[PDB]
Amino acid sequence: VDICTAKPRDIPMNPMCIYRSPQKIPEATNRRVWELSKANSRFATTFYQHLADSKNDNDNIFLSPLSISTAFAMTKLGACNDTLQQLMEVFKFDTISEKTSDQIHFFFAKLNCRLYRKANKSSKLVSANRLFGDKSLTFNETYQDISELVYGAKLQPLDFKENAEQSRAAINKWVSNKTEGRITDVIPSEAINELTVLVLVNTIYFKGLWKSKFSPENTRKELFYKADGESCSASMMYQEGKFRYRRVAEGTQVLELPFKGDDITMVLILPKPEKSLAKVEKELTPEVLQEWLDELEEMMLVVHMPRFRIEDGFSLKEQLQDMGLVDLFSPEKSKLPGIDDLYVSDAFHKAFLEVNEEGAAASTAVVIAGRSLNPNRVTFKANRPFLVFIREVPLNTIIFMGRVANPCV
Amino acid sequence: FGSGEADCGLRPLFEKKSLEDKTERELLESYI
Amino acid sequence: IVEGSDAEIGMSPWQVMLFRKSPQELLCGASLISDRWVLTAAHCLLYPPWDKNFTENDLLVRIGKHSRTRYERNIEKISMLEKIYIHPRYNWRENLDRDIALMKLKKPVAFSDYIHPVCLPDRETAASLLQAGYKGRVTGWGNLKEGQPSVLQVVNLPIVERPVCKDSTRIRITDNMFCAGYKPDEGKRGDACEGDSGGPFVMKSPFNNRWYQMGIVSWGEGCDRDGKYGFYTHVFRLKKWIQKVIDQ
Numbered sequence: 001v002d003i004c005t006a007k008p009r010d011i012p013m014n015p016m017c018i019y020r021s022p023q024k025i026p027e028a029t030n031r032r033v034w035e036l037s038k039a040n041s042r043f044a045t046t047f048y049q050h051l052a053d054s055k056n057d058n059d060n061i062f063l064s065p066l067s068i069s070t071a072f073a074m075t076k077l078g079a080c081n082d083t084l085q086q087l088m089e090v091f092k093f094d095t096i097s098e099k100t101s102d103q104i105h106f107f108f109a110k111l112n113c114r115l116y117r118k119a120n121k122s123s124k125l126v127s128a129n130r131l132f133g134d135k136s137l138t139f140n141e142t143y144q145d146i147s148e149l150v151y152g153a154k155l156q157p158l159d160f161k162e163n164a165e166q167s168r169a170a171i172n173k174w175v176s177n178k179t180e181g182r183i184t185d186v187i188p189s190e191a192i193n194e195l196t197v198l199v200l201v202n203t204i205y206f207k208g209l210w211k212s213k214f215s216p217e218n219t220r221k222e223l224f225y226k227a228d229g230e231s232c233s234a235s236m237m238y239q240e241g242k243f244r245y246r247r248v249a250e251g252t253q254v255l256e257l258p259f260k261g262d263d264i265t266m267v268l269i270l271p272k273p274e275k276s277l278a279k280v281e282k283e284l285t286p287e288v289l290q291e292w293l294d295e296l297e298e299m300m301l302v303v304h305m306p307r308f309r310i311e312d313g314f315s316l317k318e319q320l321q322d323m324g325l326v327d328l329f330s331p332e333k334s335k336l337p338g339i340d341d342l343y344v345s346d347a348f349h350k351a352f353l354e355v356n357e358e359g360a361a362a363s364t365a366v367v368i369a370g371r372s373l374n375p376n377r378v379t380f381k382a383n384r385p386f387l388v389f390i391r392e393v394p395l396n397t398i399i400f401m402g403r404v405a406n407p408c409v
Numbered sequence: 410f411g412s413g414e415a416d417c418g419l420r421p422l423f424e425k426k427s428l429e430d431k432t433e434r435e436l437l438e439s440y441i
Numbered sequence: 442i443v444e445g446s447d448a449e450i451g452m453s454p455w456q457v458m459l460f461r462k463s464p465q466e467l468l469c470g471a472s473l474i475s476d477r478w479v480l481t482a483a484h485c486l487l488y489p490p491w492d493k494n495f496t497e498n499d500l501l502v503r504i505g506k507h508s509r510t511r512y513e514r515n516i517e518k519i520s521m522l523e524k525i526y527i528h529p530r531y532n533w534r535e536n537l538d539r540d541i542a543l544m545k546l547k548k549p550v551a552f553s554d555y556i557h558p559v560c561l562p563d564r565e566t567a568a569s570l571l572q573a574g575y576k577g578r579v580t581g582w583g584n585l586k587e588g589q590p591s592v593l594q595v596v597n598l599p600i601v602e603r604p605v606c607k608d609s610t611r612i613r614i615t616d617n618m619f620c621a622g623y624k625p626d627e628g629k630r631g632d633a634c635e636g637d638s639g640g641p642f643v644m645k646s647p648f649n650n651r652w653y654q655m656g657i658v659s660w661g662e663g664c665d666r667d668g669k670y671g672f673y674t675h676v677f678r679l680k681k682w683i684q685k686v687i688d689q
């Protein structure tokens with residue numbers, strides 16, 4: 001069966017439980033998939049917020065909120081009275097459509113189907129997502145059959161009870177295999193013990209292929225100014241060109257570098273020299289960002305941007321908890337009927353961002369060959385921590401997001 | 410037009426004062 | 442100008458710098474072809490992409506200046522423009538083709554040892570001088586390397602064969618533009634750069650020993666890169682138009 005060309009009616013969708021508490025649409029786009037995305041962008045901000053509040057200011061971040069959402073959408077398939085009233089409350093699904101809710105998972109499949117398409121026609125996208133539980137159990141097997149279609153892989157049983165070593169590494173073995181080796185140690189050693197009953201594993205790797213091929217001859221070292229004022233030697237890329245940019249309020253710069261295709265860009269928030277990122281961080285709203293992406297105008301810029309790579313792996317378990325999401329992680333007050341006693345021990349995410357020059361070239365880019373002076377050219381010198389957003393333009397979906405607080409070598 | 414179409418191309422501190430500049434020769438030495 | 446050298450006093454009478462009324466700041470070179478007509482480069486005044494659309498009284502010109510910033514009392518002369526005249530078929534969209542434009546001073550300047558017009562070429566001078574291997578002379582106060590100089594920079598450059606020009610770049614070259622520069626095998630180098638545009642590419646005559654403005658600092662991919670050259674509008678190739686705006 002083909003999920004991208006599938007229909008909710010065409011395949012079994014019935015989960016097991018249900019919840020129901022009390023401006024324009026983009027062309028060639030499903031309204032439900034839209035509603036779902038708009039959701040993840042709402043979840044995203046907040047989750048980033050608490051996340052950055054944990055990680056130290058100098059620790060640069062990179063994560064795929066969407067990649068998470070879809071995954072907890074897999075537990076929702078089996079999540080009941082209270083446990084359920086949470087997933088829906090925390091992941092902002094508590095506002096979506098009815099048919100969309102009940103099939104939320106489905107649509108995430110249709111949503112990703114769409115994203116992994118736009119994201120791969122050009123750049124290298126690749127992710128490995130899967131759920132794990134102990135062989136010392138038997139799963140819904142309808143659920144473990146939907147996962148087969150709506151989540152690429154049926155749940156997987158591993159000996160957690162007696163031992164938990166060949167397992168906590170049989171996974172790190174899988175992910176590795178799947179993510180062409182780009183992802184390893186997804187699950188830290190001594191974290192998946194004999195008591196770990198259920199674990200969510202969702203990795204991902206993304207290396208955007210710029211639309212303006214960064215040209216090596218101009219890359220050079222420069223000082224990067226971290227939070228603690230200290231300097232730092234970084235590999236700095238550079239190019240002159242026309243990019244959608246805006247100098248919004250509080251004097252922070254918003255720049256958008258698109259990848260080959262325009263279906264996927266990368267938004268960079270470079271705060272003023274004084275206004276510390278921390279400020280813009282602990283002050284983000286899907287409306288403020290949507291506002292920035294709104295006021296963007298074509299411009300002539302001189303761009304300076306560090307060449308870097310980010311590996312971010314961690315437990316969502318702890319983080320989620322304090323935003324609600326308490327039951328799913330408790331053995332006592334849980335409720336995983338969609339699949340005896342069952343809860344989630346820990347959930348793991350591991351994102352991998354790679355940034356560097358062209359890994360295409362323009363031809364009608366003579367616009368900068370003109371030899372007059374240009375007093376309107378504006379420089380975007382990113383050498384201070386700045387936010388990162390990778391998104392799908394028509395839907396403004398937030399596939400990735402992060403902070404580059406330390407790109408130096 | 411303006412005025413000086415007749416006088417143009419002659420530097421007051423060179424052509425007119427019987428003087429050639431540093432690199433001037435280098436150009437003329439290239440039309441051969 | 443890249444790899445140039447400090448010009449001498451009065452070495453380029455016609456050298457005129459083009460500013461912006463306000464916030465007042467340099468932004469091109471220009472020549473002086475008569476006591477009241479300044480020849481400059483089209484996109485110095487009009488380029489939609491950088492959203493630059495200047496006009497008669499958005500800018501002024503400083504004539505007969507040798508240094509760059511110091512005010513040369515009794516030597517230099519400011520002047521406003523009475524009217525701008527961009528070429529009618531200036532194809533700024535594809536390849537800055539026909540990148541010419543002259544401006545009429547509002548009040549006729551006064552020649553001296555520092556002010557003097559550089560003769561426009563004619564079919565003969567053009568045919569006679571616009572040849573590969575022959576050297577011209579670019580001049581300006583633009584960036585020294587792909588910062589700014591202190592006095593008018595000057596550099597001499599050989600003309601390049603049509604093909605080679607066309608092959609150095611991916612852009613569609615035109616019969617209304619030639620290219621000057623040293624090859625990578627001629628050892629020596631130099632080239633106009635940023636802010637040099639509008640500048641004059643002159644050539645002295647072995648016959649009547651006069652200076653002829655053959656081209657105008659237009660565009661170029663980068664500055665002084667090996668295997669790449671600067672491109673100047675072909676002044677003569679556009680005389681017909683040049684003429685038919687002055688005669689009216």
Ligand SMILES: *[C@@H]1O[C@H](CO)[C@@H](O)[C@H](O)[C@H]1NC(C)=O
Pocket residue numbers: 120121122123124125126
């Ligand atoms: C698109 O993805 C598939 C599998 O995810 C892979 O065969 C292909 O190489 C990807 N395209 C790229 C990186 O351009």
